[PDB]
């Protein structure tokens, strides 16, 4: 009310409006699910459209061979981050020699996101991901928010409708998890959960996006014909 | 670049440069002409190190075209030549001094009265009679400390410098290729197309 | 005073066919009257079906390498993993090398694979970035030696049809893959005689539209 | 943040004014008036001291009349400090000129730059502009005697008598009465002080409340001299044109 | 006041949403891409007759391949088209080849959101980047001033622009040519314009991969005006 | 190098050799020494290969973006100025150029421009620069005049490259050739000095140091 | 630009079967003075990595202190310090390839020789050598200094080539080691008796042996030569 | 710095610092641009609240800002100072560079660059200044008359008007004005222009300004008897 002229004021309560804007940012955007076995990571993300002339906003980007992200939000912020996240790889490859671990991606993000919320003139990014990936301890996913919070899961879901998807998830919990070398079936599990978040619209072949990285698998994304198969 | 003159008469300043733009073993060109109108009633020459001495005479050119369109008025040529002076004493003590000698002949239309100067890339500012740059003063300031009268014509003051081009055609050991005259005075800056 | 360079030795070549490029270069890394390794590698496939040597100073040649590697990682994101055709890359590397002109890489490159028509490249580069595509390029310390066998034996100078006089040139072909990587052991053996830096084993890198493979022969170790 | 201080000093009102250089003048028309007279043989500056105490030291004292050059001088209408400032620029200005070109600075020259950085207040910066209005009266071999006038909003004009700070409204009125083209400094000097007389908002005009000063040629042939009246100088021709 | 770079409770940047409104005051604008090549077309809209209309320039060459129409407040417009040709002309320096046209508006689309307290508010002006390339073809996008931007099949933006897409939602398919396409363009923004449309208050361009990006003639443009008025009468 | 292009009565003649070296050693016989850099603009290259084709690429992509933002194609005088501004920066760094801007407008006419690292700016009629100029000029001095028919011209120019490519042991490999007119420059064909040095030794009857 | 002060001599290792040897001796020289005598030029990484530096001694303590931060800032927000994350010999190599040619391009060197040995995580022997320009080279025997003239040779004669390397044990490779370590004591004018040796083995892992001496030395010899040529007395 | 942006979108899509620049603009004292054949003339008002005023120094309405191209304004003074100097020395710069003085065209579009520049630049405002500019190109006889505003378009008229009371004389000129046949001669020129400012001036004495351009730099100022004229004439043709 009188707090949310900017990040640098809390509220009576302890709150941060601009942050929760920005949070309220990603609930308007479309819904995006990431799952993950063992030997395998993915992520689903269904594509939204300006109207039946237009081109379907891409949702996935690519930050290494071996890690990436879905968005759900201002998609010029996840391109702030994941050009963040790109370098950040970039650096621990030529310096180190080293992929670098999904949780240290996850750490990275958080810090940079909390930067803007702390000082005057800076805004939150208004952008979540789910970050996607595989290293030397195996597959992981992540959650990022733009209060800095980063979580990691077996699965989850963000954008409108998210809480379908997540509901299925926490019940296919003990199913999906155990889907090993196991690309497609893995695949199925997530378009399956991103369907339970579908209202009047249904998956189409210029809709669907999904992407996959796991043990002998480097981060690729599914687009137009190539997602025929799981339709 | 190489041989500068000038010469201040009675009513005019003549300003005679050679055309010679030599590179290693080769005269690359033989039709240079080595000045800048500065002024409608102001010429400026140059010699000096290749690329800095058009580059300084330009950019001179430009700061006083500059001031002509904002004050609607023309500088005089005492205090252009000061102008000059002041960015050439900068110069020297920069990174990298321009390396311009330069001759600035000029007609006051206040005073009624042509002016020589005479200045080097330290900025040593200097009004004379007749003025020259480099080697050239080795043989023609003798000369025209014995023909140059102080009364004399414009006519009169090319005589003297055509006498001054045939000593320095004969005892000078490179081939400058001619001169290009100039006169400066009431009527403005002109060419003389034949010497 | 501190002298920032080195000589890290070895020779390489690039070769072009009609439907194939080779990219060798011997194994062999010294320092002075020293052998610091008799296995080195320094040709690369740096993706795209490019490969890549920078032979001279090899900490300035693994920097270079590394950088044009990253380079062509950056391409794909920046433009939709399109990929980096052989021309562009060349031009590329042209101001990565003249980005440090008052500072240069000591190094002669070579870069090797397909044109857009399919057809075999090499490209060859200067320390400073001056670049031209050629049919043929030996680069390093034997460099000398060898490519004046190559104007010989792959563009057929100096070489006339025999009984017409002088007048009609040998005419030029294309070489086979398997007539290329003789000249290659040929000129390495050569060269491995007469120069000291260069020896220990020698690395082929061919390239087609398949892929690169790769081929490895011993040369002499003293 | 700080956003919230801040007044936002170079904006425009809806009118398309300058809020800060419209209050500015406002506080410019308390001042003491100042009158600047220009004549065919010299240039007049006549100004009004601010109310005075009868303990202020009269003779040591400066507070509309400076000397910015030798051929240059200024009377001041508005804040004494703000002007200081925008006075010492001016002479520096002048002396860089000098230093340049070897000859004295033509007057609109000084007077454009000290407009032109009055301006620059009113654009960016965020800061209060001056509350400083100049009268400059001046030579040049150019354009001769010359008089100008400065506001906080940088804009600048030439005139043949004008005046600044407090009632003039008044005084414009009263010079546009008796001034013409013909007069000499002499004549001048009167106009300036009868003006003066005449809208001041005191009870009547004394030696001890005016600052004075004239720009001849009035020196030995060519030349020009610039004369800061001393208080029994102001005193006597107060005295020889009848006021007191 | 308030931050410039403030979220509003919905979730949306008050400044990108304000700098929306300012682009639906703006003059009409329209592109359509076909198999042959991308059509461009504007309302030049003069304020006054006095005003010569070949001065009003808002189609924009920005390479041989790329074409640019502009639609809001024109004079934000400038330094977009200056850095979209500088980054065009870079890119062949720095590779040797044409830039892709989905790139071209990425980095127009970065500068974008380059405000707040970089410059002080957001570009008040839509931009249709219409080109070729030998990878994805004849492509039109539409570049906003909230960094988005979306390709489209055809795409009206400026005042008239939602009933003119509306008509190119029924008019358009995949099989249209140029010509077709051409007069499609001229139809419609003389059917959202305020005056009366001619060669003189309206500007067609196009670009095909034979002759690059090409600003049509006042002459040309008049006689797809008369051959459209033609065929409207024609049944 | 040795690079030459002259004017006369049919246009401007341009014409290049193709040797590249490093000391004595002979880095490449097949080097191109002209850039094109528009239908009506030619550069040639002598001095530094790297800072030739460098900048002289560069100079290229700034004559795009002078017609992109002034709708006209860039003058003569202007394009080489811009090269000529750009080494005057560098003056001093150690840049090796040798350069000449030729080209056709509208408003110059035919025009060449000499333009080298040390600064130096210059308008004229014909030019040779590189290590062998001065046999270059040697011929073409001797046998230049403004009449000469564009068939005659371009030998002339192809023929004292010949002359360097000869004498001067840092110029060599083959001719370049370029015509430049009113409608654009137009390409006459690389010409080998293998092949070409015998056909004028024995068409033209000259070159007789050499044992035939 | 730099003149080296208080210096350290040659670094030798080589790979084996299961792992790879690294040695140095304990001296730092000042100049011709042989300085001091209990210095450590053998710095463990780890329980997986031994880097050996030659050269320069006070930037060796620099070289020390990067890798002792360098262990810190990996055990940071890293449950799997001591596991699958725990640094790698070629993390710690690549790490200081870096600083090394980034130094020399600086203009500002550290006047350092240094091999880095160590086993990868699956196993594979780890052996690469870089120094103050930058250079880097792998090799189954490396070394430094008098090292590369004098010990390569002998520990070439045990691993000539990659093949060589499963047919050496530990026991042939230390001996090896050992011998070179003497031979390096006879002719080597800035070198101790005393001296550090290192094992890293795949299956033994890390084993760090301090104050070794350079032993079975043949000086008896010497009691025949008199003078330089004619001299019989 | 200073940093605050001061320019910037009201939810109605303004910029009302940008629109508020404008009416300063209206404010200012009225000046007119007509172009001829062969020629352009610039016409300006002078407020006649100012007597005392010394003409011979006071600051000119219309401005040289090379040889060949002339600027006049409405609006702010100045601030009108600050876009002069600034095109005064790019028209110097593209003499150095480009070897040519500037088309009128390119000095109008870096005038509103510069105008631009300030409307998205933070701790700036807007210029409350509208420009005319006209001229001819270098070896060119076509004339050339530019407008620009604080927003930072800018075009090209026939013939223009900006300042207090524009929309009255922009609405004499519209009608009076022939694009098919304009003013064939110098004299038929300064009339039109004359007129259209006697629509709303007051008295033609010194009041109004008029500087004629002819081309391959031949730029005059009329004085008062000449001006005079014209006014002396136009009021006689009117009663009728
Ligand atoms: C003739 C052959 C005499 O050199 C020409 O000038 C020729 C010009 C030329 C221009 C464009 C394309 C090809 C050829 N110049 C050369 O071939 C040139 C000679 C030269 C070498 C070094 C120089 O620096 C002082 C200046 C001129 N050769 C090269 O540039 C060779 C291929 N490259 C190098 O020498 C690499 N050096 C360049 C300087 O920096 C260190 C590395
Ligand atoms: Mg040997």
Known sequence: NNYDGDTVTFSPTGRLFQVEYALEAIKQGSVTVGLRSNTHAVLVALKRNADELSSYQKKIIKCDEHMGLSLAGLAPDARVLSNYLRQQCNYSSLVFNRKLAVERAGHLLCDKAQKNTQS???????????????????????????????????????????????????????????????????????????????????????????????????????????????? | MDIILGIRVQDSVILASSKAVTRGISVLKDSDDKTRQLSPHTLMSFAGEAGDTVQFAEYIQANIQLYSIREDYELSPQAVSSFVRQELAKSIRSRRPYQVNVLIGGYDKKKNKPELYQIDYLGTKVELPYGAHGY?????????????????????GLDLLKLCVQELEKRMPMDFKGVIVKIVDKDGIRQVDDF | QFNPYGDNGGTILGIAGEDFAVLAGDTRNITDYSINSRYEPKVFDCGDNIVMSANGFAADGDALVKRFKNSVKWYHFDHNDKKLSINSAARNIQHLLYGKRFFPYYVHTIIAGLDEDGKGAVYSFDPVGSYEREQCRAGGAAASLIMPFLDNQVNFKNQYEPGTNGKVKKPLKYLSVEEVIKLVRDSFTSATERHIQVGDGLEILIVTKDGVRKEFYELKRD | ???????????????????????????????????????????????????????????????????????????????????????????IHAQNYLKTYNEDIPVEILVRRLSDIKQGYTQHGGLRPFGVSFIYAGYD??????????????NYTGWKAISVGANTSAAQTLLQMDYKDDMKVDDAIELALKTLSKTTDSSALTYDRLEFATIRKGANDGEVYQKIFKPQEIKDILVKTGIT | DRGVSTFSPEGRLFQVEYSLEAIKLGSTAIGIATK????????????????????????????????????????????????????????????????????????????????????????????????????????????????TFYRYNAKAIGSGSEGAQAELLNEWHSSLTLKEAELLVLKILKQVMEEKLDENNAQLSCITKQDGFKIYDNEKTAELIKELKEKEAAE | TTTLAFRFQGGIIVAVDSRATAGNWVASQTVKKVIEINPFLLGTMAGGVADCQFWETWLGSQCRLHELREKERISVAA???????????????????????????????????????????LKGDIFCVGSGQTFAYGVLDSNYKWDLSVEDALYL??????????????????????????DGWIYHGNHDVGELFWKVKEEEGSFNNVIG | ?????????????????????????????????????????????????????????????????????????????????????????????????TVMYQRRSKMNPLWNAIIVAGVQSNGDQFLRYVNLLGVTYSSPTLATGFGAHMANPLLRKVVDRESDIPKTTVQVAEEAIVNAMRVLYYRDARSSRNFSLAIIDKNTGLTFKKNLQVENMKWDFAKDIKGYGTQKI | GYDRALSIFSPDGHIFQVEYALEAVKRGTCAVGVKGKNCVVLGCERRSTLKLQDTRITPSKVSKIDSHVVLSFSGLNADSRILIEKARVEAQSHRLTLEDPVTVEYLTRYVAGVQQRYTQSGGVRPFGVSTLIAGFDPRDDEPKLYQTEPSGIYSSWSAQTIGRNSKTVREFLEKNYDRKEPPATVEECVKLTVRSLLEVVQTGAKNIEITVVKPDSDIVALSSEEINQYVTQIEQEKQE
């Open chain 7, 1 to 97: 630009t730099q003149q080296p002060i208080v210096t350290g001599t040659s670094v030798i290792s080589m790979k084996y079967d299961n792992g790879v040897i690294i040695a140095a001796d304990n001296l730092g020289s000042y100049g011709s003075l042989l300085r001091f005598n209990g210095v450590e030029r053998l710095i463990p990484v780890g329980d997986n990595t031994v880097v050996g530096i030659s050269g320069d001694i006070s930037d060796m303590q620099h070289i020390e202190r990067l890798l002792k931060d360098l262990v810190t800032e990996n055990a940071y927000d890293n449950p799997l310090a001591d596991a699958e994350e725990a640094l790698e010999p070629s993390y710690i190599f690549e790490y200081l390839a």
């Open chain 6, 79 to 121: 394009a080489s100025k811009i090269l000529s501004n750009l080494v005057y920066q560098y003056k001093g760094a150690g840049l090796s150029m040798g350069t000449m801007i030729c080209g056709y407008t509208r408003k110059e006419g035919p025009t060449i421009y000499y333009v080298d690292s040390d600064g130096t700016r």
């Open chain 6, 157 to 182: 120019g192809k023929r004292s490259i010949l002359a360097a490519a000869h004498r001067d042991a840092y110029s060599g490999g083959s001719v370049n050739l370029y015509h430049v007119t009113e």
């Open chain 1, 120 to 231: 005057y003139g800076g805004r939150p990014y208004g952008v979540g991901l789910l970050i996607i990936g595989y290293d030397k301890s195996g597959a992981h996913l992540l959650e990022f928010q733009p209060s800095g919070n980063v979580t990691e899961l077996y699965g989850t879901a963000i954008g409108a409708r998210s809480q379908g998807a997540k509901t299925y998830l926490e019940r296919t919990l003990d199913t999906f998890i155990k889907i090993d070398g196991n690309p497609d079936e893995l695949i199925k599990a997530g378009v399956e959960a991103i369907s339970q978040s579908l209202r009047d619209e249904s998956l189409t072949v210029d809709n669907l996006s999904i992407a996959i990285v796991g043990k002998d698998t480097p981060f690729t994304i599914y687009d137009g014909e190539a997602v025929a198969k799981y339709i």
């Open chain 4, 141 to 154: 071999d150019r354009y001769g005697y010359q008089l100008y006038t400065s506001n906080p909003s940088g």
């Open chain 4, 1 to 91: 943040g700080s956003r919230r201080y801040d007044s936002r000093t170079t904006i425009f009102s809806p009118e398309g004014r300058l809020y800060q250089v419209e209050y500015a003048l406002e506080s410019i028309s308390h001042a003491g008036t100042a009158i600047g007279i220009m004549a065919s043989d010299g240039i007049v500056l006549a100004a009004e001291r601010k109310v005075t105490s009868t303990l202020l030291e009269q003779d040591t004292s400066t507070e509309k009349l400076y000397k910015l050059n030798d051929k240059i001088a200024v009377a001041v209408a508005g804040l004494t400090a703000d002007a200081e400032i925008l006075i010492n620029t001016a002479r």
């Open chain 5, 36 to 147: 042959e090549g991308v059509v461009l077309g504007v309302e030049k809209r003069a304020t006054s007759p006095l005003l010569e209309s070949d001065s009003i320039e808002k189609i924009v060459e920005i390479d041989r391949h790329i074409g640019c129409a502009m639609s809001g407040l024109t004079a934000d417009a400038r330094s977009m088209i200056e850095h979209a040709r500088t980054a065009a002309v870079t890119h062949n320096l720095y590779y040797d080849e044409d830039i892709n046209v989905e790139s071209l508006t990425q980095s127009v689309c970065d500068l974008a959101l380059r405000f707040g307290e970089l410059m002080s508010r957001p570009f008040g002006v839509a931009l249709l980047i219409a080109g070729h390339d030998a990878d994805d073809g004849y492509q039109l996008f539409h570049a906003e001033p909230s960094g």
């Open chain 2, 136 to 156: 050239s003063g080795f043989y023609t300031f003798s000369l025209l400390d014995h023909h140059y009268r102080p009364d004399m014509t414009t006519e009169e």
